[PDB]
Design a binder for this molecule. Structure first.
Ligand SMILES: [Ca+2]
Length: 119
């Protein structure tokens, strides 16, 4: 679930306000996605969008609402093992993205861009 994804991003980037900081970034970070990623972070979102699309082919699996079981210790992100096939897969999509986000630089210039032309 997007709210848990937010929780995962807070785990790797504690000073982040995820639903705000990454909801309109580059060509993929945010609703929809197209074109070539603008940077490293936007690249994380392209991979994440893809993962969500794949997690959608799963029998009634919505990456958007499916609530998964994960743990967040001191930075380390863990997707609990009891998760069903969808929750497990979706929790995976967000973990990999949360970790990716934390390793990519945040370039202010790539926030809220004119996707219609740059993507
Ligand atoms: Ca997207």
């Amino acid at each position: 679930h997007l709210v848990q994804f937010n929780g995962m991003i807070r785990c790797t980037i504690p000073g982040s306000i995820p639903w705000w900081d990454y909801s309109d970034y580059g060509c993929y970070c945010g609703s929809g996605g197209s074109g070539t990623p603008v940077d490293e972070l936007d690249r994380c979102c392209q991979v994440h969008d893809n993962c969500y699309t794949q997690a959608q082919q799963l029998t009634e699996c919505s990456p958007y609402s499916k609530r998964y079981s994960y743990d967040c210790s001191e930075g380390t992100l863990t997707c609990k093992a009891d998760n069903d096939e969808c929750a497990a897969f979706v929790c995976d999509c967000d973990r990999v993205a949360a970790i990716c986000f934390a390793g990519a630089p945040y370039n202010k210039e790539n926030i809220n861009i004119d996707t219609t032309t740059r993507c």
